């Protein structure tokens, strides 16, 4: 039997699924540790590896990329879980190794690849404490080219009065995503700052794991794919909307929570964003 992770229902994805909107023909790139393409609950359409020692993008030695990918697009069938946009075209852009780290050069190569391959939506559930002109340029180019770029805000929690949002989430062109639990409370780990845009479920998220498994993970890494998935549903409904329009709609129809420094605009609601 298939189970629907709490987070999927919390952002109101099932309402669209019911209407026949599931992300068909929307190309979503998961820039992460790869995706196990052998998992029976995922369908990988393509991708590329930018990790010099791990050339197959379809082998996930970490487990993180696979878990993120399932939140976006675990298939609607009779097994496992259900993603936010189960009919999307999923691309594994491998830029992290088995240990979950990666060089900026690799990440940027992955972004360049996504632009050139006409991805509609980019998901980056990764972050570093420092930026670079090259990192900023790549994300800015993707947005200028019409791509929706979503990133995890970071797991740094609070720090006096400063922003703890990492890069690339800090860049204005990117949608920076913080995490809430099932009760809509901000997770204590979720990074904070004026750059935070939206929140999504990120505590104990059940998703796919390599080797035909399923398990829960917590983090703003788990939050970001709910938003990437959300963008894919919107585009399946409104194929001629620009990335700007998709983004404004998501931001403009959230359920407001606390202060923007901690919650951004609040929790996304895809049903309201889809008009």
* Catalytic annotation, residues: 32, 64, 221
Q: How far is the CB of 174 from Ca ion (least distance, A)?
A: 7
Show the tokens assigned to 143: 């947005």
CA torsion 86-88-89-90 (nearest 10°) is -60
| Of residues 80 and 97, the one with the C-beta less far from Ca ion | 80
Question: Are 70 and 83 a contacting pair, CB within 8 Å?
Answer: yes
Least Cβ distance, residue 74 to Ca ion (angstroms): 5
Residues found near Ca ion in the complex (CB under 5 A): 2, 41, 74-75, 77, 80, 176, 195, 197
> How distant, in Å, are the alpha carbons of 36, 67, 217 from that of 57?
8, 15, 21
In the bound state with Ca ion, the residue whose beta carbon lies nearer, of 108 and 151, is 151
Bridge-partner residues for 186, per DSSP? 180
Residue reference for tokens 């959230």: 254
- CB of 233 closer than 8 Å to CB of 22: yes
Residue 267 CB, shortest distance to Ca ion, in Å, is: 16
Backbone φ and ψ for 41, nearest 5 degrees, come out as: -100, 10
Q: Which is nearest to 264 in space by CA: 246, 249, 252?
A: 252
Minimum distance from residue 79 beta carbon to Ca ion (Å): 5
């Amino acid at each position: 039997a298939q189970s629907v992770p709490y987070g999927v229902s919390q952002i109101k994805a099932p309402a669209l699924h019911s209407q026949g909107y599931c992300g068909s023909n929307v190309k979503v790139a998961v820039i992460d540790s790869g995706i196990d393409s052998s998992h029976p609950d995922l369908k990988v359409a393509g991708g590329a590896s930018f990790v010099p020692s791990e050339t197959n993008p379809f082998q996930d030695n970490n487990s993180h990329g696979t878990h993120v990918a399932g939140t976006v697009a675990a298939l609607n069938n009779s097994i496992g879980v259900l993603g936010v946009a189960p009919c999307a075209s999923l691309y594994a852009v491998k830029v992290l190794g088995a240990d979950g780290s990666g060089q900026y050069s690799w990440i940027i190569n992955g972004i360049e690849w996504a632009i050139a391959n006409n991805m509609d939506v980019i998901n980056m559930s990764l972050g570093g404490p420092s930026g670079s002109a090259a990192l900023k340029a790549a994300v800015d180019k993707a947005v200028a080219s019409g791509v929706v770029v979503v990133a995890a805000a970071g797991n740094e929690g609070t720090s006096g009065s400063s922003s703890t949002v990492g890069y690339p989430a800090k860049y204005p062109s990117v949608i920076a995503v913080g995490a809430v639990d099932s009760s809509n409370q901000r997770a204590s780990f979720s990074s904070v700052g004026p750059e935070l845009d939206v929140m999504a479920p990120g505590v104990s998220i059940c998703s796919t794991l390599p080797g035909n498994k399923y398990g829960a993970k917590s983090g703003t890494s788990m939050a970001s794919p709910h938003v990437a998935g959300a963008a894919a549903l919107i585009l399946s409904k409104h194929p001629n909307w620009t990335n700007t329009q998709v983004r404004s709609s998501l931001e403009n129809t959230t359920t407001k929570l606390g202060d923007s420094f901690y919650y951004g605009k609040g929790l996304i609601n895809v049903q309201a964003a889809a008009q």
